[PDB]
């Protein structure tokens, strides 16, 4: 609706502000990731103005998975052994999706 | 209540699994951040089992601020020029806090 249309228009404009400034400096997205340690996928989503890619992840879940992999643990198994944590990450993920859906309405 | 008590107990245990494995390898949290590019604050929150520190941030807002600073832009001003984006980040932040509050109830 009206609100979501303004949000998406602003996100596109904002993404172009970032991209323009990056391109002025002749840097790649990978250069920015190196300097800032902001993940490439997040930088891409910012420049594209993509709300879902920005808001949908349960970022803590991903941090746990990545940390587990670095430590040679099976993060999927580890989180399954913590079913209350696992369920709440699922619930937060579904909440993120609901909120994205409601914004459109 | 019952559910939140299990969640917090599991998060503490999970954090100790991570810390134990890290310490076995004699790595610091900063070493892990270097290898994984997971922010130190996120690693700390995982090891401490701190739900609020994990779930409360609107991570995209922080990514935008950090990217803006790297590009010598005032991220606060930039987001204020996008009031629909700014308002929704505030709304997501308040939602995260509400959900944390409700879990306890």
CB pairs under 8 A between A and B: 113
Solving technique for this entry?
X-ray
**Minimal C-alpha gap between A22 and chain B (Å):** 7
CATH superfamily of A1-105: lambda repressor-like DNA-binding domains (1.10.260.40)
Burial of B54 by CB count in 10 Å (0-12 exposed, 13-18 middle, 19+ buried)? buried
Both structure tokens of B78: 């930039």
DSSP A63-101: HHHHHHHHTT--HHHHHHT-HHHHHHHHHHHHHHHHHHH
Nearest chain A alpha carbon to B77 = A14
Both structure tokens of B67: 């990217």
What residues contact residue A35 under an 8 Å CB cut-off, 6+ apart? B70
Q: Which of B42, B43, B67 sits opposite A18 (nearest CB)?
A: B67
Query: Which residues of chain A neighbour B37 with C-beta distances below 8 Å?
Result: 37, 39
Both structure tokens of B69: 């600073």
Both structure tokens of B17: 């699994």
């Amino acid at each position: 609706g009206h609100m979501s249309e303004h949000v998406h228009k602003e996100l596109l404009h904002l993404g172009e502000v970032f991209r323009s400034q990056r391109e002025e400096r002749a840097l790649s997205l990978k250069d920015v990731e190196a300097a800032t340690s902001i993940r490439l996928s997040a930088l891409e989503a910012i420049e594209a103005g993509h709300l879902g890619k920005l808001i949908s992840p349960v970022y803590a879940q991903g941090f746990m998975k990545k940390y587990a992999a670095f430590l040679d643990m099976d993060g999927d198994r580890l989180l399954k052994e913590h079913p209350y944590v696992l369920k709440i990450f699922q619930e937060f993920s579904d909440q993120n999706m609901d909120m994205l859906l409601d914004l459109e309405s």
